[PDB]
Structures are given as structure tokens and as C-alpha cells.
Design a protein around this ligand. Structure first.
Ligand SMILES: Nc1ncnc2c1ncn2[C@@H]1O[C@H](COP(=O)(O)OP(=O)(O)OP(=O)(O)O)[C@@H](O)[C@H]1O
Ligand SMILES: Nc1ncnc2c1ncn2[C@@H]1O[C@H](COP(=O)(O)OP(=O)(O)OP(=O)(O)O)[C@@H](O)[C@H]1O
Ligand SMILES: [Mg+2]
Ligand SMILES: [Mg+2]
Lengths: 69, 8, 343, 343, 8
């Protein structure tokens, strides 16, 4: 199978453009989410996901406060 | 031995 | 002497009850926090807040009415030459009637309580709606806005120059609306305390435990006093509890002294090491006995005035919650040394 | 000499405490910060803001006090002839008791603190509701809305032209609601400063870092100063901490000088390199010693008056999150060069 | 060598 794989990707091209780099972006892209997709940022509490509340420093900015992210 | 305290 | 005065036996029941009312014990925790509090009021070095956490029953209120009277006595020679000065100021925070705490009522109460001096003092505020009447009672027009009331309060506090402003029931500040930051309230208090130059001593239960170390400025300028209930694990705390039980039993005004030390486990169970609850229990039992005019206090009169088990479960839940927070450990010191590039 | 005078050996505790409290030291960090702030004050050259970031207890307020004192002798000889001018003014932001900042209160307080040079001088602000009462206290009506107060403050600031407008505790400007943006508040402040042509110097903790580099305008318009502490990760800061400890030791008014050099480690544990916290701790322990009547200073009195573990934890966390944003590296310089294309 | 600073 490795020889067939090598021969095929040599004949059919490596297709480097379609490569997906295993980095943090892919890490957060593979992660799942809730049904709605976005949650509200309640002041002083954060975002409610699966019965728990999550907070971040940037949430202190009122621009993203009381809005869906 | 039991100590005895005072008023405050 | 070392016991309750003999002549109290000759006096009627109400005098014995009153004597029991005015008797304050001196346990090692009380004297230690007394020394620490006296030192920090005498010398804060820039600190603006003094938090005194404690249980419901260890003696916070009392702790102050003692510190208030002592500082008044200390400042009396200082008031002999300098006038228009109040030694201490103390108010109790008021629980709101709505979803959010009322600051306007707080400023109104503080201006009412602080300004009850001799009429000769005629300090003038910066607000027209607040007036000292001929009778002497400060009247605040309902339309005066809060910031207004506060400007005044600052002027009065900088003219009077006290040493400490006591606020009982500090956790009532935490009755904020859903979403109101719990740091903005402390920020308002710190702004009040930073330009007047007066320490703010907050007294409250372990709920006030939600007002600690919110910011670096709110942490450096804060002094944390903890008033712990007596623990059964520590042998020395057990000795202190037995000693205070013996002292209360001995000064208990009656012709016969029941052995309250024997039922020390029952006392600990129904007071959780809180001396104020123990005094309340002893007061109820003494009132029962003196109503029945008996000379011996039994376990039955101890039970008929005993708190329910669910109550003690709830208070002990609160106390464990509070005592887990301010725990200190050598590991804390060492990891703070490590994170500082000191280990 | 290099320490306190020997005459202070025959005085009371109050005199020693006052001498120590009125004693300010000049560490090299403070020297550099003072020099660059003085040079910036001399010629801002189109600078609207001088933000002063630093850890709580590093010495911001004492630096501001020394700056105004210096401005008062660089002016007094030129103020003998000239008049209707103040060298420097200051104000501290009020933490609002409501969800939103009270700009009207800021304007009223600024007008109150700015306009009290002398009863002889009179000037019409052009706003109905602002006057001076019989007591010489500038009074503003409760109905003067914010824009009118802003216009009056603008006219007063143009007339008075102070060399700088000091706003201490500037982070309190950030107490806004959901939709309110910090750029709007800083833009109002910038409009005020630019219209009156008066340089504004904002001082505060690292929370004021939320007011940094918001827009390109607010950004150019700014000389950012940093009152950094002493860090244990560099030999020079450690040596300077030891040297300031030595000079403090020689300037502690006691018959026997304690040896604080060897105990620097624990010192840096509870002070985080901030000289203000160290000074307040030293003055507290000196008050303790002079109350107990102790000739020298021991470690027990140092541990009875040091900060708590959690307080230092939160302080160091804030300090780390602050210094993480105020560091210059060659990588950023090359990134800016590449973005501009200079490389 | 330990340095001695002056008064600010
Ligand atoms: N050391 C003490 N000696 C004698 N009585 C005490 C002592 N400490 C507290 N008490 C009694 O406790 C009773 C009620 O408690 P106290 O007024 O001291 O408030 P607290 O329990 O600290 O406050 P809170 O109920 O608000 O939590 C009072 O009747 C007081 O006499
Ligand atoms: N260089 C110094 N020498 C002596 N005392 C100092 C020095 N720097 C600060 N202090 C003292 O430290 C105490 C508090 O410091 P300071 O008032 O300067 O605070 P700050 O740095 O502005 O902090 P905050 O943001 O917490 O108000 C004061 O008693 C002040 O006299
Ligand atoms: Mg109480
Ligand atoms: Mg300050």
C-alpha cells in the first residue's frame, strides 16, 4: 500500500495546495459546537456552553459584550 | 487546667 | 471577683439578666484581632480598606462597639484641644428593597449619622438640598442626586477628619443587579476613601468573601482580618473553648452553677464554636430559668431553647465555604517565590 | 550625613514617624522617570496625553507630587510679575456609583479644583448656573447639563493655561455600559485637551492600558511612560533594591540600625520590587516598634505587617499581564520595518 | 559595593 500510494501521488501529483497544516487553526476548526452556533457574552459571566460558564480577558471589552459570538 | 479570662 | 458578684443574687431577676447582657468575654482570638485592628487603625500607611471576615456569631459587631468606644476614649484627650473632629464613624449597610443596592440611601444614612454633633458646629456643604434645621436634624431633599450627596459626604469627611469609617453588613453591598460588576462597588468605596483620607473598615460574614483581591490596587490597599470560629481539631482551640465555657458558666448569675463544661460537645454542636451563638443560648436558658425562678439549669432548658439541626448544618456549610478560601500554605509561599524568579 | 540626624534621638514617636513618612528616596528608576517626565513637561511638542502606567504601589503619586512642586518654583519667580496663571493642576477620577461614568461630575470637579486662585480674580464662564458664593467656593447648579459645564471648563482652562492637567486614577474612565466604547471616552478627553491646548497626564495602574493605542489619532497623540518596578531576573535591579534597602536602613530613625540587606529575598516576595509598598511596610513596622518601644527591628515584626499571599498573587498576576504588553523587542521593530517596506 | 541614594 505504501508503494501504491507513492506511485499514485507521483503520477497524480502531490497536490500540495490541498494540504491542511496541522496547527492551532485546524485544532480549533475540528472542535465541535452547540446547536445554535453562537452564544451571548453576559457581563461578568461570559458565555454559557454545556451548563458551564466560560470567561476570557477580551470579554471585558464592551464591544463584544451582550452580543452573540 | 482551665484558664479564666476577664471582661473586655 | 473571679465569679459573678454576690449582690446580684439579692437583686431581682431583671438585674441578673442585665448583668449577663453587659458581660463581654475576652478570648484569645478577640484580643489578637484587637491588637491587630488597633495597630492598623493607628498606622495604615496608605491602605484604604480594612476587611474583617468572620462567622455569624464570633463577635464582629461587638468587636467594633468595643473599638469605637476605645478610639473615642483615646481621642477624647485629642479632642480636648482640637474641635470639629469625630473620633470614629460607624453605619450599618441597608439591604435594598429592589434587585439592586441603593447608594443614595447609603450616602443619606452616612450624612445623617456622621452629622449629629453639638449645634455650635456649623460646617456648610456643597449642596443646597441638604440642610441642617433649627431643631438639629439633617434634612435631605429627595430630589438631590447621588453624586451630589457624595460630594457633600466627602466635604464632611475631610472637615471632620475621623480615623476609621465602620460599615456593618458589608455583604449587603453585593446585592447588585444581574450583570452589575462586583468590582465597581468596591471601586466606588475606594474612590470615597482615597481622597477623604479615611480608612473604610468593612464588617461582614463570609459572603463578603466575594470582595477580595479583585484588582492589584484593591489588593495592595487592603488589609484582610479573619475572625475564626473555634475548631475541634486544634487541641488549643479546644482548651480555649472549654475555658470560655467555664467563664460563662461561672459568671452565669444563679445560686447554683450547673457544669456547662460537661456538655461541651453539645455546646460545640449547637454553636459551631461561635461565642455569640453560645451567649444567645445561655441568655435564653437563663431567661427561662429566672422566669421559673429556679437556681439550677438542666439539659431540658438547654434543649427547649436549642437551635435546630438544619440551622447548624447551614451555618457549618457557610463556615467551611469561608474557611477554605483564606487558607494559607507553605506551597503558596514557595510557588509565589518561584514565579517571582526567587526560588 | 547618609542617614537621619542624631538630634531625632531625643524626640517622641510622632516626630520620628513624621520624619520617616516625609522622607522620599530617589532610586535610579524614579530618577530616570522624573527626568523624562520633566523634559516632556518642558516641551510636549504637540503631545495631548502622557499616560503613566505602573504597578500599584510603585510611586506614581509621589512622582506627580514632586512634579507639581517643581513646577511651582519654575513658576513662582515668573509668577511674581505675571498673574491669572497656575503652574499645574490635578484631579482624580471618580469611580461611578452607577453603571456609567458621570462626565458631568468630572467637569464640575475639574472646575471646582481649577478655579480657586484668589477672590480678587473674576472671569465670566458664559454658563448660567456657575458662580462663587460668599465663602469663596465655586458653586455649580444641579441643572447645568454636561455640555454647558464642558464649555465653562474649556473657557476656564484657556484662561488659566496650566502647564499640565493631571488626571490620577484614570482607569475609572473605563466604567461604561455595553454599547459605550472606550474610544468614545478617550476621544472626548482628547477633544477637551486639544481645544484648551493643555497637556493631559493620565496616571494609573495597568488597567489604563485599555486606553492605549486605541485609534491612530489617540495614538500619535501620546507619550507613554512606564513606572516599572525592580525585577529579580536582572542583577542591576537586585543590586538597586539592595542599595535602596541599605539607604532606608540608614534612614530608619532608630538607635540601632536593623540589617535589612540579608532579608531582601522575603522583602521582594511581599513587595514585588515596588518601592512604595516597601516604604509603607517599613513605616508600619517603625510605628509598631515605636509603640512597643523596641530599639531595633526583627523579622517577626516584618511578618506581622507584610501583605498576604493571595494579595501578592493577584498583584503579580496583574503586573505580569501589564508588563507583557509594554516590552520592546527587535522582532517588533523589524515587523514594523517590513510592513512599512523600509527593510 | 552597595550604593547609597539621596532624598527625592
Ligand atoms: N466576646 C464576646 N463576649 C460576650 N458576648 C459576645 C462576644 N462576642 C459577641 N458576643 C455577643 O454576641 C451577640 C450577637 O453577636 P454580635 O452582636 O457580637 O455580632 P456578630 O455575631 O459578630 O455579627 P453578625 O450576626 O452580623 O454576623 C451579642 O449579644 C454580643 O453580646
Ligand atoms: N521613592 C519613595 N520614597 C519614599 N516613599 C515612597 C516612595 N515612593 C512611594 N512612597 C510611598 O509609598 C506610599 C504609596 O505610594 P504612592 O502614593 O506613590 O502610590 P502609587 O504608586 O501612585 O500607587 P497607587 O496606584 O496604588 O495609588 C506613600 O506613603 C508614599 O509616600
Ligand atoms: Mg452584626
Ligand atoms: Mg494613586
Amino acid at each position: 500500500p505504501r508503494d501504491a500510494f507513492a506511485a499514485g501521488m507521483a503520477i497524480g501529483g502531490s497536490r500540495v495546495h490541498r494540504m491542511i497544516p496541522y496547527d492551532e487553526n485546524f485544532q480549533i476548526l475540528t472542535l465541535p459546537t452547540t446547536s445554535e452556533g453562537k452564544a451571548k457574552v453576559q457581563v461578568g459571566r461570559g458565555i454559557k456552553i454545556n451548563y458551564i460558564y466560560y470567561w476570557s480577558n477580551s470579554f471585558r471589552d464592551p464591544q463584544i459584550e451582550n452580543t452573540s459570538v | 487546667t482551665l484558664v479564666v479570662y476577664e471582661e473586655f | 471577683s473571679t465569679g459573678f458578684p454576690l449582690e446580684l443574687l439579692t437583686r431581682p431577676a431583671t438585674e441578673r439578666l442585665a448583668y449577663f447582657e453587659n458581660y463581654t468575654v475576652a478570648h484569645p482570638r478577640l484580643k489578637e484581632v484587637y491588637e491587630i485592628l488597633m495597630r492598623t487603625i493607628a498606622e495604615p500607611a496608605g491602605a484604604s480598606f480594612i476587611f474583617v471576615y468572620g462567622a455569624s456569631g464570633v463577635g464582629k459587631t461587638t468587636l467594633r462597639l468595643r473599638v469605637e468606644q476605645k478610639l473615642t476614649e483615646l481621642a477624647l484627650p485629642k479632642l480636648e484641644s482640637d474641635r470639629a473632629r469625630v473620633p470614629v464613624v460607624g453605619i450599618e449597610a441597608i439591604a435594598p428593597e429592589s434587585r439592586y443596592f441603593n447608594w443614595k440611601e447609603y450616602y443619606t444614612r452616612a450624612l445623617i449619622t456622621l452629622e449629629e454633633p453639638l449645634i455650635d458646629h456649623k460646617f456648610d456643604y456643597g449642596v443646597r438640598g441638604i440642610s441642617r434645621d433649627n431643631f438639629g436634624k439633617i434634612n435631605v431633599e429627595s430630589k438631590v442626586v447621588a453624586p451630589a450627596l457624595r460630594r457633600a459626604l466627602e466635604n464632611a469627611l475631610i472637615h471632620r477628619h475621623p480615623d476609621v469609617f465602620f460599615v456593618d453588613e458589608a455583604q449587603h453591598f453585593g446585592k447588585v443587579a444581574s450583570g452589575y460588576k462586583l468590582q465597581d462597588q468596591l471601586d466606588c468605596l475606594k474612590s470615597l476613601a482615597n481622597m477623604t483620607g479615611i480608612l473604610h473598615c468593612l464588617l461582614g460574614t463570609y459572603e463578603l468573601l466575594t470582595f477580595r483581591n479583585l484588582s492589584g490596587q484593591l489588593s495592595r490597599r487592603s488589609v484582610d482580618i479573619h475572625f475564626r470560629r473555634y475548631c475541634a481539631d486544634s487541641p488549643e482551640d479546644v482548651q480555649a473553648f472549654k475555658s470560655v465555657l467555664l467563664t460563662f458558666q461561672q459568671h452565669l448569675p444563679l445560686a447554683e452553677t450547673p457544669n456547662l463544661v460537661d456538655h461541651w460537645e453539645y455546646f460545640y454542636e449547637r454553636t459551631l464554636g461561635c461565642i455569640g451563638t453560645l451567649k444567645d443560648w445561655l441568655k435564653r436558658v437563663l431567661s427561662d430559668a429566672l422566669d421559673r425562678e429556679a437556681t439550677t439549669i438542666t439539659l431540658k432548658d438547654l434543649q427547649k431553647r436549642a437551635l435546630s439541626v438544619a440551622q447548624c448544618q447551614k451555618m457549618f456549610k457557610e463556615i467551611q465555604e469561608g474557611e477554605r478560601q483564606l487558607s494559607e500554605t507553605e506551597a503558596d509561599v514557595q510557588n509565589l517565590r518561584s514565579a517571582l524568579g526567587l526560588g
